[PDB]
Amino acid sequence: RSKEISIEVEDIKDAGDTGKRLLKINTPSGARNIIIENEDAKALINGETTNTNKKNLQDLLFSDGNVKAFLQATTTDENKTALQQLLVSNADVLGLLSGNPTSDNKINLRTM
Amino acid sequence: RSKEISIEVEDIKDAGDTGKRLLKINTPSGARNIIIENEDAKALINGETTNTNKKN
């Protein structure tokens, strides 16, 4: 009358749906496919990201939109103004970096 | 003896603690919650990151 009575996964009456899928899975990749629903996060964990995955992960990682544009290597003139302000504190130098200094900036830049 | 045999997760005597939690879990999200302890890494894998998660 046998020795072991090897039950199967579906015999475990209080196992959950994800729990049974995991118990059946053979490899770590298969387990990650069950557990991680966000496709961008799954791509990071698999070490295999497209440019779209990268942009989407950057959206999860950074709040500032001007920083995000810099990280995408695509900045508008407005993004550039804001990024200049993160990099330089002197108002007259910020005027120079804009390419369009005010009259006051010009006087102060010459003095500088 | 009837031969179908219904055995529950806790009948598996050499199953590990995490192993039994995974066998019971119903969805991939539930599995990720068991497996990934670092909250910032879990957030990346879930595709749902705060600014704090991003910095970390």
Swiss-Prot record, chain A:
It is found in: Virion. It comes from the Viruses. Protein that forms the 55 capsid fibers. These fibers are not always present and may have been lost in some lab strains. They may enhance the attachment of the virions onto the host cell wall. Belongs to the phi29likevirus major capsid fiber protein family. Homotrimer. Forms a super helix coiled coil in the homotrimer. This is Capsid fiber protein. It comes from Bacillus phage phi29 (Bacteriophage phi-29). The chain holds residues 114 to 225 of 280 of the full protein.
UniProtKB/Swiss-Prot annotation, chain B:
It is found in: Virion. It comes from the Viruses. Belongs to the phi29likevirus major capsid fiber protein family. Protein that forms the 55 capsid fibers. These fibers are not always present and may have been lost in some lab strains. They may enhance the attachment of the virions onto the host cell wall. Homotrimer. Forms a super helix coiled coil in the homotrimer. This is Capsid fiber protein. The lineage of its organism: Viruses, Duplodnaviria, Heunggongvirae, Uroviricota, Caudoviricetes. The chain holds residues 114 to 169 of 280 of the full protein.
